[PDB]
Amino acid sequence: SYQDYINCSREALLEKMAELLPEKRLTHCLGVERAAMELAQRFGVDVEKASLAGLLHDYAKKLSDQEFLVLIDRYQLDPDLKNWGNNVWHGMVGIYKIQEDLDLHDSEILRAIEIHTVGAGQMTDLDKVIYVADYIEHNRAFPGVDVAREIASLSLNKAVAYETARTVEYLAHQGFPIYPQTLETYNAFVHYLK
């Protein structure tokens, strides 16, 4: 049960998250919960850790900038984090709010949430499951999601590679700064696209 990792039941968690997140965002989290379970079944990852990390991954999406900056100071995180924003923070810093609220201490689940946006050069299978589930969950509708879904049915590593390449491409297309850890992920995984 989820109570094996956090301080409340799944139903109680859902009630808490409904107060913290807009409907669309909670619906997304539920989609990621389901997609993470399916991917974990496919690629030999604990379905429960995957489902819980999937549901929680965007728990901190709506924390204010000031709340994130307070968390950076409190936990003495990389001071460069103050140069970025919600995109980087909600996973990389938001894990600490999840930990405070839910008494989540499982290192594997925490890490998978931490890097769900930016990835890392080295990713556990659980990390990869969450990173991909976020991108392919059933509510997502962006052009090319069908390609990501096909790839994810065959290869976890290729799905990470594809998602990361598309993300780097889009950020540059839009003219947005790219958090450097994303490039680390990109260069580590891009070979899987062959």
Ligand X SMILES: Nc1ncnc2c1ncn2[C@@H]1O[C@H](COP(=O)(O)OP(=O)(O)O)[C@@H](O)[C@H]1O
Contact residue for ligand X among 12, 18, 147, 178 (CB under 6 A): 178
Is residue 33 near ligand X by the rule CB under 6 A? no
**Are the C-beta atoms of residues 116 and 57 closer than 8 Å to each other?**
yes
- The answer on whether 105 is annotated among ligand-binding residues is no
Q: Is 193 in the site for a copy of itself (CB under 8 A)?
A: yes
- Both tokens of residue 186? 């990109």
Q: According to the annotation, is 101 in a ligand binding site? A: no
- 162 lines the binding site for ligand X (CB under 6 A): no
Is there a binding annotation on residue 11?
Answer: no
What is the distance between the alpha carbons of residues 133 and 129, in angstroms, rounded to a whole number?
Answer: 6
The one among 35, 50, 157, 167 contacting ligand X by CB under 6 A? 167
Q: Which range binds ligand X by CB under 6 A, 16-24, 41-49, 112-120, 122-130?
A: 112-120
Q: Tell whether residue 117 is a contact of ligand X (CB under 6 A).
A: yes
φ, ψ of residue 130 to 5 degrees: the values are -70, -45
| Residues ending a continuous segment of the chain before a break (C–N > 2.5 Å) | none
CA angle, corner 14, sides to 4 and 51, nearest 5? 50
Identify which of 146, 125, 126 has the alpha carbon closest to the alpha carbon of residue 135.
Answer: 146
The minimum distance between CB 165 and a copy of itself, in angstroms, equals 5
87 belongs to an annotated ligand binding site: yes
Contact window for a copy of itself (CB under 8 A) among 11-19, 35-43, 69-77, 170-178: 170-178
CA 51/CA 43 separation, integer angstroms: 14
Residue 89 CB, shortest distance to ligand X, in Å, is 10
Find out whether 167 and 102 touch, Cβ atoms under 8 Å: no
Name the one residue in this structure whose structure tokens are 């107060």.
Answer: 19
Site residues for Fe ion, window 129-188 (CB under 5 A)? 134
Contact positions vs a copy of itself (CB under 8 A): 161, 165-166, 168-169, 172-173, 175-178, 180, 183, 186-187, 190, 193-194
Binding-site residues for UDP, in ranges, read: 25, 61, 179, 182
